[PDB]
């Protein structure tokens with residue numbers, strides 16, 4: 001395959017010292033978990049369980065993330081990235097790192113965010129609210145990309161919104177990685193519905209632009225009220241669902257530009273599909289969230305070619321955000 005690199009923040013890690021990106025050599029100093037009392041379970045994941053908690057020394061609510069120590073290298077990676085991004089706009093704030101004295105199970109302590117139930121919010125969301133929150137996510141992505149970090153797991157589940165205080169946080173940096181130009185990454189990242197075509201065609205030399213495809217998937221589900229937008233049943237079928245919208249002509253243009261070898265598993269399922277107009281997804285239930293600006297913005301995110309998608313900074317300058325601060 002033809003090599004590729006990010007259009008932006010290409011050399012940010014190259015120009016920094018080893019301490020910033022060499023997470024395996026990072027010294028993790030675990031405090032005492034006795035300062036925290038667990039309140040309730042907030043969620044369960046493959047390698048973590050998240051709890052609402054109280055810091056007993058200041059009577060302040062926190063969030064405690066207990067990690068199943070399946071791979072130390074992955075825990076070190078998450079800790080280093082959270083330490084590097086600490087205090088960035090709309091990035092979840094790591095406040096402490098603890099180990100329970102008896103269990104010795106690694107746990108991350110974060111700032112508390114009061115998540116509004118999405119199912120309830122989803123119905124009351126306006127065109128303005130979508131633009132406002134999209135912009136908040138973009139601030140988080142432009143910042144972490146500027147810091148040489150790819151989140152690689154952008155999805156509704158990893159976005160927290162406190163609608164009452166119009167606060168948003170991008171969470172779960174467990175799959176995030178440092179971007180190094182020319183590096184070949186593991187394509188087994190992100191959640192099925194949000195995986196970019198680069199991952200599905202096994203093109204390993206991807207970059208920050210993967211996050212912009214995932215964001216495009218979220219934008220499409222939100223404005224069209226179709227969750228998920230690309231409803232694959234497996235990773236191969238996921239590409240077929242994308243091809244039913246973007247068409248197969250542009251897919252062959254993409255794999256040809258990077259000299260990608262399409263897996264034979266695609267041979268009998270891909271078929272032939274025309275390029276669909278974004279206006280075909282407009283219906284009575286969602287027309288109040290759709291506008292020519294939104295469709296033009298969506299069209300600039302949902303492109304096979306990772307290099308031709310808008311960067312987070314270019315996305316922030318799009319006319320769709322001319323109504324937000």
Ligand SMILES: O=C(CC(=O)Nc1cccc(C(=O)O)c1)NCCCNCc1ccc(-c2ccccc2)c(Cl)c1
Pocket residue numbers: 042043050063065092110115118129130133134156157158159160161171172173218219222
């Ligand atoms: O995962 C959790 C629990 C939790 O608090 N987890 C957590 C907390 C703190 C840190 C961590 C961590 O893993 O680092 C995890 N909550 C799920 C929140 C789901 N958010 C729903 C949602 C929010 C915003 C959007 C959205 C809004 C406007 C435009 C586009 C998208 C959507 Cl689609 C969905």
